[PDB]
Design a protein around this ligand. Structure first.
Ligand SMILES: OCc1cc(-c2ccccc2)on1
Length: 126
């Protein structure tokens, strides 16, 4: 069901949380090579999370599950913020700008954290 599909999406999001915090440890240790690889992994995970989220929202719409559609619109809006800041983070890494990278790393955390009470609400609506 859409619910199992959201569980699969939730797991992929958690995988990105795991890799992100392991990437944040590398960065603070100055292990740039590991960071470069982790950032490639994270993008691949976020891109796959986005795809499971879009399919879930489209399916909620085809089902007419108005509340789930509302919440998923709100979720996908927060999700595009993460994308924007994530792409700037990667750009700061490319540029060698550690000050901007640190800042973007903190932003994503508050973007991910804030967007979590919604994520649990979607589970319960689908
Ligand atoms: O905070 C959620 C989030 C989403 C993304 C993202 C990154 C790159 C492409 C698409 C999405 O990064 N963080």
């Amino acid at each position: 069901s859409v619910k199992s599909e959201y569980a699969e999406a939730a797991a992929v999001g958690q995988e990105a949380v795991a890799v992100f915090n392991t990437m944040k440890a590398a960065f603070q240790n100055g292990d740039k090579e590991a960071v470069a690889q982790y950032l490639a992994r994270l993008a691949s995970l976020y891109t796959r999370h986005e795809e499971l989220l879009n399919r879930i929202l489209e399916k909620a719409r085809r089902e007419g599950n108005k509340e789930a559609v509302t919440l998923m619109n709100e979720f996908t809006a927060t999700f595009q913020t993460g994308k924007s800041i994530f792409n700037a983070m990667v750009a700061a890494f490319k540029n060698g700008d550690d000050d901007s990278f640190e800042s973007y790393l903190q932003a994503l955390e508050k973007v991910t954290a804030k967007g979590e009470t919604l994520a649990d609400q979607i589970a319960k609506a689908l």
